[PDB]
Amino acid sequence: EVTLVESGGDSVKPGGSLKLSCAASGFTLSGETMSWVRQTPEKRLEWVATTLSGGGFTFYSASVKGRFTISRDNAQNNLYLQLNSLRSEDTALYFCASHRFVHWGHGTLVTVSAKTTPPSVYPLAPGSAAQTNSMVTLGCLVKGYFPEPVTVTWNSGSLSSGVHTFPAVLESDLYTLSSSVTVPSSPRPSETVTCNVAHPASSTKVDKKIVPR
Amino acid sequence: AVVTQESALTTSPGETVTLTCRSSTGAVTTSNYANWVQEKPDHLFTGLIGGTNNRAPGVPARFSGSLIGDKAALTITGAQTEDEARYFCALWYSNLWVFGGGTKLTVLGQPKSSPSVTLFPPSSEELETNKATLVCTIIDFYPGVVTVDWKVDGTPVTQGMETTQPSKQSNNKYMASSYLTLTAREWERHSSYSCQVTHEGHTVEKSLSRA
Ligand SMILES: O=C(O)CN(CC(=O)O)C[C@H](Cc1ccc(NC(=S)NCCO)cc1)N(CC(=O)O)CC(=O)O
Ligand SMILES: [Fe+3]
Numbered sequence: 001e002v003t004l005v006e007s008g009g010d011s012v013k014p015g016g017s018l019k020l021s022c023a024a025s026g027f028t029l030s031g032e033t034m035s036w037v038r039q040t041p042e043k044r045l046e047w048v049a050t051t052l053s054g055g056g057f058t059f060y061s062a063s064v065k066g067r068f069t070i071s072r073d074n075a076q077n078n079l080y081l082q083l084n085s086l087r088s089e090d091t092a093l094y095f096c097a098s099h100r101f102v103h104w105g106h107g108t109l110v111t112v113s114a115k116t117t118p119p120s121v122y123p124l125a126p127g128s129a130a131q132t133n134s135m136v137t138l139g140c141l142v143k144g145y146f147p148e149p150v151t152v153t154w155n156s157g158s159l160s161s162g163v164h165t166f167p168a169v170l171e172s173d174l175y176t177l178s179s180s181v182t183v184p185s186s187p188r189p190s191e192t193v194t195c196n197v198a199h200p201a202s203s204t205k206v207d208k209k210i211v212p213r
Numbered sequence: 214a215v216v217t218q219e220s221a222l223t224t225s226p227g228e229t230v231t232l233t234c235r236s237s238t239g240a241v242t243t244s245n246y247a248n249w250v251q252e253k254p255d256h257l258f259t260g261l262i263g264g265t266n267n268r269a270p271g272v273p274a275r276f277s278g279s280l281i282g283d284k285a286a287l288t289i290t291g292a293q294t295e296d297e298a299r300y301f302c303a304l305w306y307s308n309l310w311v312f313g314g315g316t317k318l319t320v321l322g323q324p325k326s327s328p329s330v331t332l333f334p335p336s337s338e339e340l341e342t343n344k345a346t347l348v349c350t351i352i353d354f355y356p357g358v359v360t361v362d363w364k365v366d367g368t369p370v371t372q373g374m375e376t377t378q379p380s381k382q383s384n385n386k387y388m389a390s391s392y393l394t395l396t397a398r399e400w401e402r403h404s405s406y407s408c409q410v411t412h413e414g415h416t417v418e419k420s421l422s423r424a
Pocket of ligand 1: 033050052053057099100246248263264305307308
């Protein structure tokens with residue numbers, strides 16, 4: 001069986017240098033053309049570089065030339081990539097594919113940003129609302145955190161169904177996440193709904209009680 | 214060069230669907246070694262076709278590659294439910310690889326369905342920090358494609374609006390969310406705010422009148 005696992009990804013400051021690695025298994029690297037591809041936040045696939053087998057040429061994308069270098073470590077059955085004048089444009093999930101992108105390894109996120117920060121929670125309550133379905137939707141805006149991940153729960157478990165946690169969005173070197181729940185207009189405001197947000201890295205725990213508007 | 218792909222297509226289990234790939238430089242040929250891969254949820258990637266016809270080991274017979282017209286094409290004969298995925302194409306222009314934008318393929322695994330839109334006004338706590346994040350959430354829509362457009366007093370708000378990427382709910386339906394960000398000052402200058410969610414020819418609008 002073939003196997004490719006990439007590593008090396010980490011946060012990095014704009015201008016910073018980074019070195020990624022693709023370790024292979026199930027084959028001999030030497031007579032195997034390897035490609036480095038990237039999937040951007042926008043969920044677009046972009047070609048980065050290709051190194052031919054034998055001992056041939058290495059082709060670079062124009063978006064990468066001069067700044068990124070490729071290498072093999074046939075001896076350790078490894079493939080490296082030197083990331084060097086990291087620009088914003090570069091935050092992405094770096095994968096390595098074998099010949100004609102048959103086999104692909106799991107990826108490694110590199111994020112070009114500013115610095116670590118605990119999240120600011122905002123309770124999102126309906127503007128002097130109604131109840132179409134005798135159902136009301138409340139949310140929580142988990143804003144400006146660094147780095148990922150985050151843990152968002154409602155009445156710590158209790159509200160499970162109705163809940164819709166959405167993926168983060170990065171904008172000025174900080175993430176923006178959102179979550180919600182929809183309860184019958186019987187439970188809120190009669191009973192309370194709290195959103196339990198934790199930015200585990202920062203060891204931040206925050207509770208917000210959603211109160212009318 | 215630029216490689217072009219249809220945004221999205223949809224079929225029913227059992228049908229035959231064709232996805233195409235096109236080169237802006239001229240007719241795609243064998244010299245471009247047309248390559249086709251599939252992205253499954255959680256960014257899982259598997260190459261299906263390579264060399265403009267050859268089906269990679271493992272991959273089932275239902276996928277075929279060829280050139281028809283001045284383009285590369287991937288035919289999925291009797292398209293199964295588990296084929297709902299994203300299909301990318303790559304063409305080799307004797308020096309590099311140009312990847313296309315993918316096609317989100319839907320295999321109608323349950324009735325067409327409409328989005329549940331809800332617009333949230335900015336929090337007070339937040340207005341104090343001089344920021345105004347309006348949140349628009351889109352839910353339980355099927356197929357997983359939507360266009361969000363923002364309007365402030367009629368005028369489409371051309372910037373500082375970020376939308377997410379549809380994701381799968383346990384009911385294999387999808388969700389998304391858009392944001393608008395103004396300073397607390399920009400917010401004050403306007404009395405009307407609209408979030409518009411278009412889905413299969415049908416615009417859904419949710420609003421709030423600030424003043
Ligand atoms: O594999 C790639 O990424 C490119 N492929 C096309 C393909 O395999 O789909 C094409 C590649 C053939 C190949 C080799 C080199 C060039 N370019 C040269 S010599 N440029 C000189 C610049 O001064 C083009 C094509 N491979 C042939 C094949 O797969 O049969 C060689 C190989 O795979 O080892
Ligand atoms: Fe090749």
